[PDB]
């Protein structure tokens with residue numbers, strides 16, 4: 001499963017190979033996959049919608065809301081960036097620690113949600129242990145500033 005605290009897991013060559021085998025299929029339809037993931041998260045955890053002021057007052061037809069679609073792709077693109085540089089641990093650390101600080105003080109998001117959205121991200125793309133490890137690294141780092 002996905003964890004959000006403790007030492008960072010290490011992605012093996014095997015892990016990276018599996019991730020790189022599965023990702024292209026998702027990436028090629030990033031708009032709809034990214035949207036589906038966020039919508040699923042909001043359906044499973046309606047109480048999490050309060051964490052997105054840009055669409056927190058929006059009810060019904062979220063799929064057509066520009067703020068919802070944009071929020072979804074911004075999250076997806078960050079994951080895409082990380083996958084694109086799995087060989088550079090330092091870059092991933094630096095980048096995500098900075099983002100962690102922004103979510104804490106600027107976006108004022110409760111770090112408890114990262115793991116929940118990530119779980120839905122993984123199940124949506126039918127990812128396996130390899131992706132859970134990837135998202136564990138991502139969540140631990142996004143939770144680091146808290």
Ligand code: HEM
Pocket residue numbers: 048051052053054071074075076078079099102103107109110113114117118138142
């Ligand atoms: C895999 C997990 C996640 C990743 C990789 C991620 C990534 C991002 C990125 C890259 C941005 C844009 C940064 C910027 O504009 O400077 C962002 C913004 C934001 N994220 Fe996250 N995020 C994640 C999970 C969450 C969760 C769980 C919530 C809320 C429950 C959340 C709420 C927000 C909000 C409110 C913004 C600000 C949007 C805006 O004002 O334009 N994020 N996130």
